[PDB]
Each structure stands twice: as structure tokens, then as C-alpha cells.
Design a protein around this nucleic acid. Sequence first.
DNA 1: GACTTGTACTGGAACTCACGTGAACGAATGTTTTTAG
Length: 92
Amino acid sequence: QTVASHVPFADLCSTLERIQKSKGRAEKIRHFREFLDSWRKFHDALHKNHKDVTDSFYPAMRLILPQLERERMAYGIKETMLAKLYIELLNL
DNA sequence: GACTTGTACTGGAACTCACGTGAACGAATGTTTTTAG
């Protein structure tokens, strides 16, 4: 029962947007700490009858720090390819 | 990982203000000593 299955991507996107918008490092750290605390509290409340489940913050941590992603190889779609694919798919 | 550039935060020093302490000069007054009439 992974926590990421119950956490919408919109919440993470909003947290990242708030972090970027904030000017002082204190506000960014506060936002990230609030998100992490909510995630940890939800994880603790979900896995009550647990057996040392291998569920952690990796699903969100990898997205927050894509540069450290080693499990997944190169996507093969760079900025030019992404722009092209957006053009065909959206039928612009 | 080491260097460079750029941005943000922050505690200490500079400045000012105000007061207290001590030292020096001159004004005004009072008082004492000495000397010419």
C-alpha cells in the first residue's frame, strides 16, 4: 500500500510552485518540511499493522531531484522533441 | 570536486545623543596688607 498511490500529483506540483515562488530560503524550507511531515504522518497512520514495509519518500524524492535518477535511463525526448510532440498531440 | 559569479541575510562598528566627572579661565565681589598724603 504505497503512499504515493493516495497522494495526487497536483499537491506535489503546488508545493513545488510555492517553493519556487517564495523568495526567502526560510519559506521554501518551511513548505518542504510541511509536505514531508504530512507525508510521514500519512505513512505512519497507513502502515499500522506493518512488517517493515519498503515504502518511503522515493516516489516523490526522485521527482523532486530528477538529476539523481539513475534507475531510469535517458527518456530520449529532449526540449526539441518535447515541443514537437506537444505540437502533434495537441493538433495545433 | 574545485573555482567563479551573483544574491540574500546579519551581527558588529560608526555615528549620534545624553549625562557625568574633572580641569581651566575670567568676571564679579569681598577682604586683607601695605604705602603715600
